[PDB]
């Protein structure tokens, strides 16, 4: 039995998740990888993939035959290129008339209340290399918020495209198993739960409201007999950040201690009429400073003077790029820049989703049939990846099979 969370050193470590003690410009990049949305990209494009894969080629071809049966009563040798153009435009409106309803329903199921958050995951793994895998069995939100007819109300039109009537049902029921899986799982905060490690027969015990909950080691900490330190991104910086905090408060201490314009040895304010503002502090005891010897018999032979400025902002300036280097390296962050651009587009890499969302979606989340994605799947627009999925979809490759008749 040894504590992991509620030790003073580890709560000092958990504090740097927020900004309470020390903060610089490099720690702003920590929130950028703390940004969720990339997890919604995962379930998003994965349910697009599930909706787009399960389709039959034989349905869309008879849809095209009935589509031509629609146009022959509306409109010989010129009909060859007429049928080519109307098929091309049929493919275009097929992409459109799937993509709009997908954009409605999938964003509708996407921005539900999810008690699981990537944001509450990424700070925990970077803090201690450990994550509480909490299985919270309340799952009555999804059927209450969405039960039926949300897939049925929008699709009622003239052209009874049975492709949509086949895909909307399977994509609708597929989300009812996926949102189930994420909302069944749970990740808490830190300030009210704790985590316990027993050295004797080494396992780890989670705690929240009095029970041992499931867990997943990723970065096992170094337990010496005197203290425990965690192999973590932030605790690879820990006492350097505390050193910068110490010298900054030290700098303000000396700055506030030499404010007197003159040193003796014994032996509403921000804005106002400056003439009266002179009077309001010249009488104040901030002006004088008479230093003291303790013993009255103890005399002073010589006296010196040296105000001193410790290099505070210099200590902040290198520690900014200290933060930048660690969060470019241990999490693969490639700054997409312009010519002499000062880090304008900070983006996930190929392997950093395998090292953050890879373990996330497959260890603490039981999202079994979901995948990781490409660089340009997460880089591009979230609706602009939809037609790109379409460009390598089973559907549009069947339609480009129909692309030659």
Nearest to 169 by CA among 141, 150, 143: 150
Q: How far apart are CA 42 and CA 48, in angstroms?
A: 10
Candidates 173, 177, 203, 351: give the one binding a copy of itself (CB under 8 A): 351
CA-based nearest residue to 386, from 15, 4, 169, 101:
101
Footprint on residues 175-194 left by a copy of itself (CB under 8 A): 189-192
> Taking CB under 8 A as the criterion, which residues in 366-395 touch a copy of itself?
368-369, 371-372, 374-375, 380-384, 392, 394
Structure tokens at 71: 């146009």
Q: Is 118 exposed, middle or buried (0-12, 13-18, 19+ CB in 10 A)?
A: buried
Nearest-angstrom CA–CA distance, 113 and 145: 9
Minimal distance in Å, beta carbon 139 to a copy of itself?
18
- Closest to a copy of itself by CB, 1 or 338: 338
135 interacts with a copy of itself by CB under 8 A:
no
- Which of residues 137 and 282 has its CB atom nearest to a copy of itself in the complex? 282
Q: Does 405 bind a copy of itself (CB under 8 A)?
A: yes
- Residues between 143 and 162 that touch a copy of itself (CB under 8 A): 154, 158
Choose which of 3, 66, 93, 165 interacts with a copy of itself (CB under 8 A): 93
Residues 271-290 that bind a copy of itself (CB under 8 A): 274-275, 277-279, 281-282, 284-290
**Quick one: tokens of 331?**
């999490």
Tell me if 250 contacts a copy of itself by CB under 8 A: yes
CA 78-82-85 angle, to 5 degrees, is: 145
Q: Which stretch binds a copy of itself (CB under 8 A): 136-144, 163-171, 177-185, 252-260?
A: 252-260
Options 2, 69, 198, 293; binder of a copy of itself; rule CB under 8 A: 293
| Interaction between residue 173 and a copy of itself (CB under 8 A) | no
Applying CB under 8 A, the span of 90-98, 130-138, 167-175, 178-186 interacting with a copy of itself comes to 90-98
User: What is the token pair recorded at 148?
Assistant: 């039926």
| Contact call for residue 9 and a copy of itself (CB under 8 A) | no
| Residues ≥6 apart with Cβ < 8 Å to 270 | none
Distances (CA, A) of 399 to 379, 388, 391, 402: 27, 15, 11, 5
Q: Is 242 helix (H, G, I), strand (E, B) or coil?
A: helix
Using CB under 8 A as the binding rule, whether residue 339 contacts a copy of itself is answered as: yes
């Amino acid at each position: 039995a040894i504590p992991v969370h509620p030790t003073p050193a580890s709560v000092r470590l958990f504090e740097i998740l927020q900004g309470k003690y020390a903060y610089v410009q490099g720690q702003t990049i920590y929130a950028n990888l703390r940004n969720p949305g990339v997890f919604s990209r995962q379930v998003f494009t994965h349910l697009f993939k599930r909706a787009i894969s399960h389709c039959t080629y034989d349905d869309v071809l008879h849809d095209w035959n009935k589509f031509e049966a629609c146009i022959q009563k509306r409109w010989d040798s010129c009909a060859s290129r007429f049928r080519e153009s109307t098929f091309e435009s049929w493919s275009t409106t097929m992409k459109l008339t799937v993509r709009d309803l997908l954009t409605t329903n999938i964003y509708r199921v996407l921005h539900s209340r999810s008690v699981l958050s990537y944001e509450r995951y990424v700070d925990w793994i970077c803090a201690t290399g450990m994550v509480p895998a909490v299985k919270k069995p309340i799952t009555q939100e999804l059927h209450s918020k969405i039960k039926s007819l949300r897939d049925r109300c929008v699709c009622r039109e003239l052209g009874h495209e049975r492709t949509i009537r086949s895909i909307g049902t399977e994509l609708y029921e597929a989300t009812k198993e996926i949102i189930e899986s994420l909302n069944s799982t749970f990740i808490p905060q830190f300030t009210e739960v704790t985590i316990e490690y027993l050295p004797r027969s080494d396992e780890y015990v989670a705690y929240y409201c009095g029970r041992r909950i499931r867990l997943h080691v990723l970065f096992p900490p170094a337990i010496f007999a005197g203290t425990v330190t965690f192999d973590s991104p932030v605790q690879r910086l820990y006492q350097n950040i505390f050193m910068c905090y110490r010298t900054l408060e030290h700098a303000k201490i000396c700055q506030l201690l030499n404010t007197a314009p003159l040193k003796a040895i014994v032996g509403d304010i921000l804005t106002g009429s400056t003439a009266s503002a002179i009077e309001k502090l010249f009488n104040s005891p901030s002006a004088s400073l008479g230093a003291r010897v303790s013993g009255h018999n103890e005399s002073i032979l010589n006296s010196f003077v040296s105000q001193y400025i410790p290099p505070s902002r210099e200590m902040t300036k290198d520690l900014t790029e200290l933060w930048e280097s660690e969060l470019f390296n241990t999490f693969k962050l490639t700054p997409v820049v312009d010519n002499q651009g000062q880090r304008l587009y900070v983006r996930y890499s190929s392997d950093t989703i395998s090292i953050l969302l890879g373990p996330f979606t497959y260890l603490v989340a039981e999202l079994s049939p979901v995948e990781l994605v490409t660089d340009v799947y997460a880089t591009l627009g979230i609706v602009e990846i939809i037609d790109e999925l379409y460009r390598s979809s089973r559907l549009a490759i069947y339609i480009e099979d129909l692309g030659r008749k």
